[PDB]
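User: hey, got a sec? need IGE06 folded
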Amino acid sequence: NLPRCTEGPWGWVCM
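Assistant: Yep! Here you go:
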């Protein structure tokens, strides 16, 4: 996966 983060359930999760 390309480097990038998204707001997830348990805070910001990152690739």
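Quick note: Strands lie at 5-8, 11-14. Let me know if you need anything else on IGE06.
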